[PDB]
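User: These chains co-purify. Model them together.
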Amino acid sequence: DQENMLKISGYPGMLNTFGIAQLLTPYRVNGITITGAQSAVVALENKFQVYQAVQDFNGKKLDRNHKLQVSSLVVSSPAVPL
Amino acid sequence: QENMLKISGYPGMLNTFGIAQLLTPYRVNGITITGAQSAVVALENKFQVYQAVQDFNGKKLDRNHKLQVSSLVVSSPAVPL
Amino acid sequence: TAYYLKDAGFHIRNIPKAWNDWNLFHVFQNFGKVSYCRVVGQSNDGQVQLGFVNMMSVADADEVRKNLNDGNLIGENFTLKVTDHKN
Amino acid sequence: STAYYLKDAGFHIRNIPKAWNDWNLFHVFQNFGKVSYCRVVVQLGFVNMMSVADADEVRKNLNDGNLIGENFTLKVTDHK
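Assistant: Joint model of the four components:
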């Protein structure tokens, strides 16, 4: 299910899956997939939490050495203009 | 044993990721759920446990939830402060 | 019908017929973070829709309530009937 | 998951009074922020703060790298 997913990277490399979940507070995390990478693919509750997480966290400076990168296939798609 | 803390009082909906989110920024290594609103949590070491109990015991999350956070850990300096 | 954070959700009635869930969402996002946002049915010949919106926290829900006028959310060009979800 | 703790957040401590244990060292540093790790080996020690922000505050309270209390002077250096 495509629109529950975001990619996050640029977080400190020592984080475990709980620590990646802490990054995303307060959004509901249902799954984290860790690979050989220093990125992770995270499943959130739904497209609205994904949309808000990308907003909140993409580009966020954690400190002088870590600027998060967060991205997803989710585009805000109102039926009528706002 | 000194890595453990007991946490309870959070919303009953939280999965274990949500319980770990409560303890930001302390490092969580394992969570064992012991009720609808209670869990045993393994943190990184005793100083994070001690600090977590300080920051979060009695913390009011909202008007319907108050955390009770406890541990076996006590501050035991060899020389007084 | 599902597990929700006490005092954080709202039932919406009288939603304009052309909105989808993104419209509904963007309305409540102006007051705080949103957990669940859903169009749950139609009503009055199909002319208005019913909705449900759960906020990320009670604080966020109370931020919605503070902008409420006798149970109604007045915006530019719409009025929704917002009602506290009780468990 | 990497092998190394967070960057710019650790310190090496020399000049620790010999009677101190980890709890004594811990409490000195807790005054500047949350502490992630704390060990003693006069004696040497290591303290990692929870974040760079905490550890920078530690750095904001130094004199040519020294932490001065009433009965002690710890020599403190960045773990890089």
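Strands of chain C lie at 9-16, 34-43, 48-55, 72-75, 78-84.
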